[PDB]
Amino acid sequence: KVQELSVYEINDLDRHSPKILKNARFGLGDLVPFTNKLYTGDLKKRVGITAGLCVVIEHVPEKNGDRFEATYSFYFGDYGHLSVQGPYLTYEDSFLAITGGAGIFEGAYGQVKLQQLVYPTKLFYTFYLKGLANDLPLELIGTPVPPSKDVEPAPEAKALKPSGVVSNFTN
Amino acid sequence: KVQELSVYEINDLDRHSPKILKNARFGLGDLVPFTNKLYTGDLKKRVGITAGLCVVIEHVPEKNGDRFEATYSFYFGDYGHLSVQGPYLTYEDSFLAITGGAGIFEGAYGQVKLQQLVYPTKLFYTFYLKGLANDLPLELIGTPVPPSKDVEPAPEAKALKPSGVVSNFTN
Amino acid sequence: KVQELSVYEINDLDRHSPKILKNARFGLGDLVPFTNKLYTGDLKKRVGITAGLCVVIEHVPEKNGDRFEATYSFYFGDYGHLSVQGPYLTYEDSFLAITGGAGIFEGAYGQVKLQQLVYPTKLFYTFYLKGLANDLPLELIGTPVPPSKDVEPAPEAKALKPSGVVSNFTN
Numbered sequence: 001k002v003q004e005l006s007v008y009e010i011n012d013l014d015r016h017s018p019k020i021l022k023n024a025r026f027g028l029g030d031l032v033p034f035t036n037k038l039y040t041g042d043l044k045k046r047v048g049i050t051a052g053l054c055v056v057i058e059h060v061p062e063k064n065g066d067r068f069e070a071t072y073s074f075y076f077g078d079y080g081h082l083s084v085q086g087p088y089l090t091y092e093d094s095f096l097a098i099t100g101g102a103g104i105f106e107g108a109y110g111q112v113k114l115q116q117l118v119y120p121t122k123l124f125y126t127f128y129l130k131g132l133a134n135d136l137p138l139e140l141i142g143t144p145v146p147p148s149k150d151v152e153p154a155p156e157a158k159a160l161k162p163s164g165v166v167s168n169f170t171n
Numbered sequence: 172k173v174q175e176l177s178v179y180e181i182n183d184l185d186r187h188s189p190k191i192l193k194n195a196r197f198g199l200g201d202l203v204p205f206t207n208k209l210y211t212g213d214l215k216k217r218v219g220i221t222a223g224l225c226v227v228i229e230h231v232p233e234k235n236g237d238r239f240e241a242t243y244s245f246y247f248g249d250y251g252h253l254s255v256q257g258p259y260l261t262y263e264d265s266f267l268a269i270t271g272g273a274g275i276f277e278g279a280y281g282q283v284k285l286q287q288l289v290y291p292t293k294l295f296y297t298f299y300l301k302g303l304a305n306d307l308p309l310e311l312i313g314t315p316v317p318p319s320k321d322v323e324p325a326p327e328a329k330a331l332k333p334s335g336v337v338s339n340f341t342n
Numbered sequence: 343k344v345q346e347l348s349v350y351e352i353n354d355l356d357r358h359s360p361k362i363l364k365n366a367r368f369g370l371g372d373l374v375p376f377t378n379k380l381y382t383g384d385l386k387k388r389v390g391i392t393a394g395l396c397v398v399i400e401h402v403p404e405k406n407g408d409r410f411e412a413t414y415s416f417y418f419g420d421y422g423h424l425s426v427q428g429p430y431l432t433y434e435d436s437f438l439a440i441t442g443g444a445g446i447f448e449g450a451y452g453q454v455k456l457q458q459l460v461y462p463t464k465l466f467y468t469f470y471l472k473g474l475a476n477d478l479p480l481e482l483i484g485t486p487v488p489p490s491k492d493v494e495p496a497p498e499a500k501a502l503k504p505s506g507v508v509s510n511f512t513n
């Protein structure tokens with residue numbers, strides 16, 4: 001069965017990220033190691049971080065954007081993590097492959113929808129998760145805030161209050 | 172059930188690829204972001220591109236070749252993509268792991284045979300695909316042209332004619 | 343069913359590894375392509391190598407350590423390989439996702455426990471392997487030597503004697 005799981009990835013520019021390694025405008029040769037903050041779909045709790053690498057594939061002169069090939073993980077503190085591989089395109093939504101998971105996400109497979117909001121500041125993901133041993137914990141599956149350019153994490157989540165973080169949230 | 176899927180990866184050297192990032196002869200430290208053209212097994216249609224990264228592991232003085240560790244995706248336009256992780260060896264055939272997929276390839280698992288033809292210009296892959304929700308579309312499963320150093324994509328595919336490309340082929 | 347598989351990864355510093363690519367103390371931007379030796383859990387045989395990339399995510403001033411995001415494979419000679427994606431933390435144990443496999447490991451999924459021993463010299467992994475077509479070969483599933491800072495591969499394995507290597511062990 002498909003378990004849907006949405007999360008917000010938010011870049012506050014306090015994590016040295018994205019650290020552009022310029023070897024190539026974005027072109028092949030450009031490497032972008034990155035790590036952003038990760039929040040629940042309902043924006044109430046900090047869950048952890050994203051962490052991995054974007055490989056610039058090319059600039060697209062046409063759509064004033066770039067195409068990346070991405071390999072990264074989404075960390076949910078004590079819950080574990082999900083891993084993905086796929087396209088990140090600055091100019092449209094994309095689906096990435098779910099390569100696997102750990103913790104509650106052990107056995108994870110399927111695909112994930114990546115949704116553009118602010119560039120490169122806010123992203124909204126919806127994981128179409130199969131293969132989990134159990135139903136997702138309730139604190140991770142609150143009704144997601146519908147994505148827009150203005151939606152924001154709860155103050156307690158930004159501030160890192162016990163009420164706005166999951167157990168041993170990834171920092 | 173195993174669905175077999177063969178594709179030709181072709182480098183025309185018009186995509187800035189391979190963009191060698193020399194930090195190490197090929198040795199550890201060398202990083203090779205790459206992207207090539209991707210065609211159907213029967214060579215009739217352009218499907219998309221490959222895109223990802225080869226990490227040089229070592230030079231092999233013995234077999235006048237090199238060993239790479241590769242993380243990349245195969246893009247099939249509107250159909251989605253397949254992702255892989257594994258060995259690329261300039262001197263023999265290898266099998267890579269299928270890490271996942273998106274679109275029609277959602278749930279993909281198994282292994283893929285990589286076959287050397289021209290170096291590093293033409294490769295022939297055979298995906299032993301399990302986990303797909305449906306049978307592969309007929310335009311992707313035409314009887315493959317048996318691999319050799321001379322086999323070539325149809326003129327319409329090189330030229331990008333409607334008859335020689337899949338829907339929204341990855342470019 | 344879960345098949346448990348333990349292996350020792352050992353760095354002898356004869357493989358040019360880890361080849362630190364300094365772009366950032368370890369911080370984001372730092373890239374660490376690596377390849378180490380790989381032995382059976384019972385330390386009797388050389389099976390192959392590890393090979394892939396660690397992406398520094400950040401230094402942790404608190405725990406005098408660093409957090410990495412890792413994408414790599416474990417090579418077992420003629421048997422094939424396993425691929426993973428996940429966290430490598432110099433200061434605690436971690437679980438990585440099993441993204442797939444090839445050979446006898448085709449269809450592999452699950453998670454792997456990474457255990458710290460010497461830094462960065464000896465690691466002990468325990469793969470909780472699901473999805474394999476057959477039971478693991480007996481030479482790979484000998485009772486593992488319980489991990490400590492002093493445990494070592496058998497002399498024949500270091501020396502590469504026929505009795506201390508698997509068939510076509512990855513070198």
Ligand SMILES: [Mg+2]
Pocket residue numbers: 098099100109269270271280440441442451
């Ligand atoms: Mg997988």
